[PDB]
Coordinates of N, CA and C and ligand atoms in Angstrom, one line a residue:
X4 N 148.0 -50.0 173.6 CA 149.2 -49.1 173.8 C 150.0 -49.4 175.1
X5 N 150.0 -50.7 175.5 CA 150.8 -51.2 176.7 C 152.3 -51.4 176.2
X6 N 153.2 -50.6 176.6 CA 154.6 -50.6 176.1 C 155.3 -51.9 176.8
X7 N 154.8 -52.5 177.8 CA 155.5 -53.7 178.5 C 154.9 -55.0 178.0
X8 N 153.8 -55.1 177.2 CA 153.0 -56.3 177.0 C 153.8 -57.3 176.1
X9 N 154.8 -56.9 175.4 CA 155.6 -57.7 174.5 C 156.3 -58.8 175.3
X10 N 156.7 -58.6 176.6 CA 157.6 -59.5 177.3 C 156.8 -60.8 177.6
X11 N 155.6 -60.8 178.2 CA 154.8 -62.0 178.4 C 154.4 -62.6 177.0
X12 N 154.2 -61.8 176.0 CA 153.9 -62.4 174.6 C 155.1 -63.2 174.1
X13 N 156.3 -62.7 174.3 CA 157.5 -63.5 173.9 C 157.7 -64.7 174.8
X14 N 157.4 -64.6 176.1 CA 157.5 -65.8 177.0 C 156.6 -66.9 176.5
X15 N 155.4 -66.6 176.1 CA 154.3 -67.6 175.6 C 154.8 -68.2 174.3
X16 N 155.3 -67.3 173.4 CA 155.8 -67.8 172.1 C 157.0 -68.8 172.3
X17 N 158.0 -68.4 173.2 CA 159.1 -69.4 173.5 C 158.6 -70.7 174.0
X18 N 157.5 -70.7 174.9 CA 156.9 -71.9 175.4 C 156.4 -72.8 174.2
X19 N 155.7 -72.2 173.3 CA 155.2 -72.9 172.1 C 156.4 -73.5 171.3
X20 N 157.4 -72.8 171.1 CA 158.6 -73.2 170.3 C 159.2 -74.4 171.1
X21 N 159.4 -74.4 172.4 CA 159.9 -75.5 173.2 C 159.0 -76.8 173.0
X22 N 157.7 -76.7 172.8 CA 156.8 -77.9 172.6 C 156.9 -78.4 171.2
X23 N 157.3 -77.6 170.3 CA 157.5 -78.0 168.8 C 158.7 -79.0 168.7
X24 N 158.5 -80.2 168.1 CA 159.6 -81.2 167.9 C 160.7 -80.6 167.0
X25 N 160.4 -79.7 166.1 CA 161.4 -79.0 165.2 C 162.4 -78.2 166.0
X26 N 162.1 -77.8 167.3 CA 163.1 -77.0 168.1 C 164.2 -77.8 168.7
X27 N 164.1 -79.1 168.7 CA 165.0 -79.9 169.6 C 166.5 -79.7 169.3
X28 N 166.9 -79.6 168.0 CA 168.4 -79.3 167.7 C 168.9 -77.9 168.2
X29 N 167.9 -77.0 168.6 CA 168.2 -75.6 168.8 C 167.9 -75.2 170.3
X30 N 167.5 -76.1 171.1 CA 167.1 -75.8 172.5 C 168.3 -75.4 173.4
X31 N 169.5 -76.0 173.2 CA 170.7 -75.8 174.0 C 171.8 -75.5 173.0
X32 N 172.9 -74.9 173.5 CA 174.1 -74.6 172.6 C 174.5 -75.9 171.8
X33 N 174.9 -75.7 170.6 CA 175.5 -76.8 169.7 C 176.6 -77.5 170.5
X34 N 176.6 -78.8 170.5 CA 177.6 -79.6 171.3 C 178.8 -79.8 170.5
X35 N 179.9 -79.2 171.0 CA 181.2 -79.1 170.3 C 181.9 -80.5 170.3
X36 N 181.4 -81.5 171.1 CA 182.0 -82.8 171.1 C 181.4 -83.6 169.9
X37 N 180.1 -83.3 169.5 CA 179.4 -83.9 168.4 C 179.9 -83.2 167.1
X38 N 180.2 -81.8 167.1 CA 180.5 -81.0 165.9 C 181.8 -80.3 166.2
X39 N 183.0 -80.9 166.1 CA 184.3 -80.3 166.6 C 184.8 -79.1 165.8
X40 N 184.3 -78.9 164.6 CA 184.7 -77.8 163.7 C 183.7 -76.6 163.8
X41 N 182.7 -76.7 164.8 CA 181.6 -75.7 164.7 C 182.1 -74.2 164.8
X42 N 183.1 -73.9 165.7 CA 183.6 -72.6 166.0 C 184.5 -72.1 164.9
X43 N 184.9 -73.0 164.0 CA 185.7 -72.6 162.7 C 184.8 -71.9 161.7
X44 N 183.5 -72.1 161.8 CA 182.4 -71.7 160.8 C 181.6 -70.6 161.5
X45 N 181.2 -70.8 162.8 CA 180.2 -69.9 163.5 C 180.9 -69.1 164.6
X46 N 180.9 -67.8 164.4 CA 181.5 -66.8 165.3 C 180.7 -66.5 166.5
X47 N 179.3 -66.5 166.4 CA 178.4 -66.1 167.5 C 177.3 -67.2 167.7
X48 N 177.6 -68.2 168.5 CA 176.6 -69.2 168.9 C 175.4 -68.6 169.5
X49 N 174.2 -69.2 169.2 CA 172.9 -68.8 169.8 C 172.0 -70.0 169.9
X50 N 171.1 -70.0 170.9 CA 170.1 -71.1 171.1 C 168.9 -70.6 171.9
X51 N 167.8 -71.4 171.9 CA 166.6 -70.9 172.5 C 166.7 -70.8 174.1
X52 N 167.5 -71.6 174.7 CA 167.6 -71.5 176.2 C 168.3 -70.2 176.5
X53 N 169.3 -69.8 175.8 CA 170.0 -68.5 176.0 C 169.1 -67.4 175.7
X54 N 168.2 -67.4 174.7 CA 167.2 -66.4 174.4 C 166.2 -66.3 175.7
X55 N 165.7 -67.4 176.1 CA 164.7 -67.4 177.2 C 165.4 -66.9 178.5
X56 N 166.6 -67.3 178.8 CA 167.3 -66.8 180.0 C 167.6 -65.3 180.0
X57 N 168.0 -64.7 178.8 CA 168.2 -63.3 178.6 C 166.9 -62.5 178.8
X58 N 165.8 -63.0 178.3 CA 164.5 -62.4 178.6 C 164.1 -62.4 180.1
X59 N 164.2 -63.6 180.7 CA 163.8 -63.7 182.2 C 164.7 -63.0 183.1
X60 N 166.0 -62.7 182.7 CA 166.9 -61.9 183.5 C 166.6 -60.4 183.4
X61 N 165.7 -60.0 182.5 CA 165.5 -58.6 182.3 C 166.6 -57.9 181.5
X62 N 167.2 -58.6 180.5 CA 168.3 -58.1 179.7 C 167.9 -57.9 178.2
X63 N 166.6 -57.9 177.9 CA 166.2 -57.4 176.6 C 165.4 -56.1 176.9
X64 N 165.6 -55.0 176.1 CA 164.9 -53.8 176.3 C 163.6 -53.8 175.4
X65 N 163.7 -54.5 174.3 CA 162.6 -54.5 173.2 C 162.4 -55.8 172.6
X66 N 161.3 -56.1 171.9 CA 161.1 -57.4 171.2 C 162.0 -57.4 169.9
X67 N 162.5 -56.2 169.4 CA 163.4 -56.2 168.3 C 164.7 -56.9 168.6
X68 N 165.2 -56.7 169.9 CA 166.5 -57.3 170.3 C 166.3 -58.8 170.4
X69 N 165.2 -59.3 170.9 CA 164.9 -60.8 171.0 C 164.8 -61.3 169.6
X70 N 164.1 -60.7 168.7 CA 164.0 -61.1 167.3 C 165.4 -61.2 166.6
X71 N 166.3 -60.3 166.8 CA 167.7 -60.4 166.3 C 168.4 -61.7 166.7
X72 N 168.3 -62.0 168.0 CA 168.9 -63.3 168.5 C 168.2 -64.5 168.0
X73 N 166.9 -64.6 167.8 CA 166.2 -65.8 167.3 C 166.7 -65.9 165.8
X74 N 166.7 -64.8 165.0 CA 167.1 -64.9 163.6 C 168.6 -65.4 163.4
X75 N 169.4 -65.1 164.4 CA 170.8 -65.6 164.5 C 170.9 -67.1 164.6
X76 N 169.9 -67.7 165.4 CA 169.8 -69.2 165.5 C 169.7 -69.7 164.1
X77 N 168.7 -69.2 163.3 CA 168.4 -69.7 162.0 C 169.6 -69.4 161.0
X78 N 170.2 -68.2 161.0 CA 171.3 -67.9 160.1 C 172.5 -68.8 160.4
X79 N 172.7 -69.2 161.6 CA 173.8 -70.1 162.0 C 173.5 -71.5 161.4
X80 N 172.3 -71.9 161.4 CA 171.9 -73.2 160.8 C 172.2 -73.2 159.3
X81 N 171.8 -72.2 158.6 CA 172.1 -72.1 157.2 C 173.6 -72.0 156.9
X82 N 174.4 -71.4 157.7 CA 175.8 -71.3 157.5 C 176.5 -72.6 157.8
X83 N 176.1 -73.4 158.8 CA 176.8 -74.6 159.2 C 176.4 -75.8 158.4
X84 N 175.2 -75.8 157.8 CA 174.7 -77.0 157.1 C 175.5 -77.3 155.9
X85 N 175.8 -78.6 155.6 CA 176.6 -78.9 154.4 C 175.7 -79.1 153.1
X86 N 174.4 -79.1 153.4 CA 173.3 -79.3 152.3 C 172.1 -78.5 152.7
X87 N 171.4 -77.9 151.7 CA 170.1 -77.3 151.9 C 169.0 -78.3 152.0
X88 N 169.3 -79.6 151.8 CA 168.4 -80.7 152.0 C 168.6 -81.5 153.3
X89 N 169.4 -81.0 154.2 CA 169.7 -81.7 155.5 C 168.5 -81.7 156.4
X90 N 168.4 -82.8 157.2 CA 167.3 -82.9 158.2 C 167.3 -81.7 159.1
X91 N 168.4 -81.3 159.8 CA 168.4 -80.3 160.8 C 168.1 -78.9 160.2
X92 N 168.7 -78.6 159.0 CA 168.4 -77.3 158.3 C 166.9 -77.3 157.9
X93 N 166.3 -78.4 157.5 CA 164.9 -78.4 157.1 C 164.0 -78.1 158.3
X94 N 164.4 -78.6 159.5 CA 163.7 -78.2 160.7 C 163.8 -76.7 161.0
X95 N 164.9 -76.2 160.8 CA 165.1 -74.7 161.0 C 164.2 -73.9 160.1
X96 N 164.0 -74.3 158.9 CA 163.1 -73.5 158.0 C 161.6 -73.5 158.4
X97 N 161.2 -74.7 158.9 CA 159.7 -74.8 159.4 C 159.6 -73.9 160.6
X98 N 160.6 -74.0 161.6 CA 160.5 -73.3 162.8 C 160.6 -71.8 162.6
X99 N 161.4 -71.3 161.6 CA 161.5 -69.9 161.2 C 160.1 -69.4 160.7
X100 N 159.5 -70.2 159.9 CA 158.1 -69.8 159.3 C 157.2 -69.6 160.5
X101 N 157.1 -70.5 161.4 CA 156.3 -70.5 162.6 C 156.6 -69.2 163.5
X102 N 157.9 -69.0 163.8 CA 158.3 -67.8 164.5 C 157.8 -66.5 163.9
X103 N 158.2 -66.4 162.6 CA 157.9 -65.1 161.8 C 156.4 -64.8 161.8
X104 N 155.6 -65.9 161.7 CA 154.1 -65.8 161.6 C 153.5 -65.2 163.0
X105 N 154.1 -65.6 164.1 CA 153.7 -65.2 165.5 C 154.3 -63.9 166.0
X106 N 155.6 -63.6 165.6 CA 156.3 -62.4 166.1 C 155.8 -61.1 165.4
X107 N 155.2 -61.2 164.3 CA 154.8 -60.0 163.5 C 153.9 -59.1 164.3
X108 N 152.9 -59.6 164.9 CA 151.9 -58.8 165.7 C 152.5 -58.3 167.0
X109 N 153.5 -59.0 167.6 CA 154.2 -58.6 168.8 C 155.0 -57.3 168.4
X110 N 155.7 -57.3 167.4 CA 156.5 -56.2 166.9 C 155.6 -55.0 166.5
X111 N 154.5 -55.2 165.8 CA 153.6 -54.2 165.4 C 153.0 -53.5 166.6
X112 N 152.5 -54.3 167.6 CA 151.8 -53.7 168.7 C 152.8 -52.9 169.5
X113 N 154.1 -53.4 169.7 CA 155.1 -52.6 170.5 C 155.4 -51.3 169.9
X114 N 155.7 -51.3 168.5 CA 156.1 -50.1 167.8 C 154.9 -49.1 167.8
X115 N 153.7 -49.5 167.7 CA 152.5 -48.6 167.8 C 152.4 -48.0 169.2
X116 N 152.5 -48.8 170.2 CA 152.5 -48.4 171.7 C 153.5 -47.3 171.9
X117 N 154.8 -47.5 171.4 CA 155.9 -46.5 171.6 C 155.6 -45.3 170.9
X118 N 155.1 -45.3 169.6 CA 154.7 -44.1 168.9 C 153.6 -43.3 169.7
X119 N 152.6 -44.0 170.2 CA 151.6 -43.3 171.0 C 152.2 -42.6 172.3
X120 N 153.1 -43.3 173.0 CA 153.8 -42.8 174.2 C 154.5 -41.5 173.8
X121 N 155.1 -41.4 172.7 CA 156.0 -40.3 172.2 C 155.2 -39.2 171.4
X122 N 153.9 -39.4 171.2 CA 153.0 -38.5 170.3 C 153.1 -37.1 170.7
Ligands
ZHA1 C1 173.3 -81.8 157.5 C2 174.0 -82.5 158.5 O1 174.4 -83.7 158.3 N1 174.3 -81.8 159.7 C3 173.8 -80.6 160.3 C4 173.2 -79.5 159.7 C5 172.8 -78.4 160.5 C6 173.1 -78.3 161.9 C7 173.8 -79.4 162.4 C8 174.2 -80.5 161.7 C9 174.2 -79.3 163.9 C10 174.2 -77.9 164.5 C11 173.0 -77.1 164.1 C12 172.7 -77.1 162.7 O2 172.0 -76.2 162.2

């Protein structure tokens, strides 16, 4: 029933994601010199360095807010890819499966802790 425990749990999960080879296209903002049409397709850029900085600045209130921004990294990959068989999109789907498998208990414990607080 620790209402604050999600923050260290999310720091440790971001560390694992940075060690994963599948995260490399997603660690920093998409390079507009490499992809000059990117902002014609994607209205809200997101990347794992921006997620980690927002967490360490104390600018997330809950793990649900962090989860929304990580899911935006993956939806941006699906929208920008020219093929569902592309190398970079294929990496995004493995990373998404890994993320979803690990964040489920983080979300469950936080929501249980808050219900107990408000009982
Ligand atoms: C398939 C292909 O040739 N290119 C491709 C696909 C997806 C993505 C990128 C390039 C770069 C930006 C991030 C992203 O998700």
